Amino acid sequence: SNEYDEYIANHTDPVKAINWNVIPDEKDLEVWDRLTGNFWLPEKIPVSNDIQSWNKMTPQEQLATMRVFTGLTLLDTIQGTVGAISLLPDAETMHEEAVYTNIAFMESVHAKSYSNIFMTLASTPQINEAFRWSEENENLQRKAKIIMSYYNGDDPLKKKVASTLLESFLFYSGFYLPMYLSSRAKLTNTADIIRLIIRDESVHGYYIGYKYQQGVKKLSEAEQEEYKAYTFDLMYDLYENEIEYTEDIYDDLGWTEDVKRFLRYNANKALNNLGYEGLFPTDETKVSPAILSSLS
Amino acid sequence: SNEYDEYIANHTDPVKAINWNVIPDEKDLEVWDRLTGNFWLPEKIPVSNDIQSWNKMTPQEQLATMRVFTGLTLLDTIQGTVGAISLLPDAETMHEEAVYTNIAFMESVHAKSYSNIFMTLASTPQINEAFRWSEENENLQRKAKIIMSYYNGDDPLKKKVASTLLESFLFYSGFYLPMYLSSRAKLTNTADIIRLIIRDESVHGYYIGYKYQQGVKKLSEAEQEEYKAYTFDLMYDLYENEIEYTEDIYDDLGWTEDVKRFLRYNANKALNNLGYEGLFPTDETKVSPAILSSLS
Numbered sequence: 001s002n003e004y005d006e007y008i009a010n011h012t013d014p015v016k017a018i019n020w021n022v023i024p025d026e027k028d029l030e031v032w033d034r035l036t037g038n039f040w041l042p043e044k045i046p047v048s049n050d051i052q053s054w055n056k057m058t059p060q061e062q063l064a065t066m067r068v069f070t071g072l073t074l075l076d077t078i079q080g081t082v083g084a085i086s087l088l089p090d091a092e093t094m095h096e097e098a099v100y101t102n103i104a105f106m107e108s109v110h111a112k113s114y115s116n117i118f119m120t121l122a123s124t125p126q127i128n129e130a131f132r133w134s135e136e137n138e139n140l141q142r143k144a145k146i147i148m149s150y151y152n153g154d155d156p157l158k159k160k161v162a163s164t165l166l167e168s169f170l171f172y173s174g175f176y177l178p179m180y181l182s183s184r185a186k187l188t189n190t191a192d193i194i195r196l197i198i199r200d201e202s203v204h205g206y207y208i209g210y211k212y213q214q215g216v217k218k219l220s221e222a223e224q225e226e227y228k229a230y231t232f233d234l235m236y237d238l239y240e241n242e243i244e245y246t247e248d249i250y251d252d253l254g255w256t257e258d259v260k261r262f263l264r265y266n267a268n269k270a271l272n273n274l275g276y277e278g279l280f281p282t283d284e285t286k287v288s289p290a291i292l293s294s295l296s
Numbered sequence: 297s298n299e300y301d302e303y304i305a306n307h308t309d310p311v312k313a314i315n316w317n318v319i320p321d322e323k324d325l326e327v328w329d330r331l332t333g334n335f336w337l338p339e340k341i342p343v344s345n346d347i348q349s350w351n352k353m354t355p356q357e358q359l360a361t362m363r364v365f366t367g368l369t370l371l372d373t374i375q376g377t378v379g380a381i382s383l384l385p386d387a388e389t390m391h392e393e394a395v396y397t398n399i400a401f402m403e404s405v406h407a408k409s410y411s412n413i414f415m416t417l418a419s420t421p422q423i424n425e426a427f428r429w430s431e432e433n434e435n436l437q438r439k440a441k442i443i444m445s446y447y448n449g450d451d452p453l454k455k456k457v458a459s460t461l462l463e464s465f466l467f468y469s470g471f472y473l474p475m476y477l478s479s480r481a482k483l484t485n486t487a488d489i490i491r492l493i494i495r496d497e498s499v500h501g502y503y504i505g506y507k508y509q510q511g512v513k514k515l516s517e518a519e520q521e522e523y524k525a526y527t528f529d530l531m532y533d534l535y536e537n538e539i540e541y542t543e544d545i546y547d548d549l550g551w552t553e554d555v556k557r558f559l560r561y562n563a564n565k566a567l568n569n570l571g572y573e574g575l576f577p578t579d580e581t582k583v584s585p586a587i588l589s590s591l592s
């Protein structure tokens with residue numbers, strides 16, 4: 001009578017070792033190859049070359065940078081330690097499970113990148129105040145808890161919708177700032193780190209959205225309509241909360257209207273990643289060219 | 297809109313973003329820097345340069361290689377998708393959670409490496425027969441299910457003991473083969489992939505064992521003694537099972553007695569990583585210096 005006798009007697013199916021010679025879904029391999037081939041660490045970027053432009057930035061630009069980046073750090077902390085991990089049990093293939101372990105790790109690299117930037121450019125008090133602000137900001141905590149409510153739940157598809165909206169939508173109110181600043185010769189090296197992060201997030205959102213589409217198409221007619229309604233309802237809720245967050249971050253700078261257009265643009269892309277039409281007419285998504293141009 | 301209100305009302309404390317500017321345990325940063333600094337993918341090693349060496353190996357040598365490598369793949373599949381992940385909820389620090397995400401990913405890289413080796417060296421039937429054998433071998437399935445039984449349990453410390461014994465002891469009836477072959481100038485590029493895996497495992501066992509010690513030392517002397525008994529008891533069971541696994545894989549080649557000494561050498565290392573004295577007398581753990589050097 002060993003402690004594990006019941007577990008063993010109860011799990012008669014053989015535990016399987018992953019076999020990469022047999023791939024049920026080629027997309028898993030394509031994504032594994034793309035993500036691992038794109039491996040990077042923030043130390044590879046010379047952020048210290050940004051010290052002069054940081055000191056040149058206005059008090060308002062530095063405050064917005066600290067806050068936005070702390071908000072992004074929080075989402076990556078969540079996605080790396082809870083989000084991506086929550087998708088493993090519902091994977092269609094073993095190679096998909098492997099891909100999620102890479103996503104989890106890279107989210108931790110993304111989160112750490114912001115501390116590398118902070119430690120290189122900012123003062124300790126600025127850093128401490130930013131993290132304190134992130135704990136007290138009601139909109140940031142609300143988007144974080146709404147997302148974590150699904151990861152902690154028991155519905156596999158909801159976890160993929162939440163994850164895709166987090167990856168293809170929730171980060172953008174934050175990616176706007178370094179793309180703007182870099183088009184004005186400010187934080188150009190920091191912007192190279194943000195571009196490496198975007199290179200990963202675009203793939204993450206595309207992939208998890210793809211898996212959601214495969215899973216939801218396995219359902220009954222009524223159920224597929226229910227998940228579509230759930231997705232648009234969650235998107236509206238997150239968008240409404242994001243408008244508030246955006247106003248509070250950028251109103252002083254006066255960039256708010258352009259950032260809101262950027263929000264609508266990315267919300268449409270998030271929904272498209274999940275297989276749905278956009279929520280906003282295309283004419284409401286006209287972010288300035290300088291921004292989509294800095295993204296390039 | 298309403299679906300997450302309850303969760304939000306029950307999680308009033310702020311969700312925290314990881315801050316790498318404040319490290320409550322220096323070891324977490326040391327290990328993160330070491331593991332990430334040691335990033336590698338199997339594609340970096342020219343395994344195809346081992347084809348002549350592989351083709352000269354006997355059918356018995358090839359079969360043992362296919363089986364030990366598939367058993368190692370099974371262990372890494374479990375560790376990356378279930379093991380490291382099970383340690384997240386019990387972390388003492390947020391930086392420790394980040395480290396586990398890197399460990400999860402690298403275990404997936406390890407598992408994939410054996411497929412890279414098989415896909416380069418072995419025939420399709422050989423690969424299919426190896427995975428089939430892995431599903432049917434009672435000792436392999438038993439060690440996997442014993443370890444998984446603790447990952448699936450609710451005792452955090454038992455998860456770490458299981459993980460450390462998996463990493464510091466179980467992987468070893470397996471690394472003996474490539475290191476010995478390497479000392480006979482056979483499969484030398486494959487051995488380079490094995491050394492990259494060992495460089496990681498070494499750190500994983502050390503780190504998780506270190507966290508196990510920190511946690512058990514918070515208990516009474518009486519509870520500490522019960523965990524020590526549990527640890528030795530689990531080692532007796534895994535050792536007994538491993539002896540049989542070793543005899544079946546190695547008897548044909550005639551390497552069994554030396555692999556058993558190697559099992560005892562590693563069982564002592566695994567117990568040491570958990571803070572305990574070794575189980576076997578030093579004189580019962582002799583390992584050839586030609587193996588020990590590639591082990592390094």
Ligand SMILES: [Fe+3]
Nearest residue numbers: 076107110201
């Ligand atoms: Fe990220």
Ligand SMILES: [Fe+3]
Nearest residue numbers: 167200201204
């Ligand atoms: Fe991501």
Ligand SMILES: [Fe+3]
Nearest residue numbers: 372403406497
């Ligand atoms: Fe491993």
Ligand SMILES: [Fe+3]
Nearest residue numbers: 463496497500
């Ligand atoms: Fe390991």
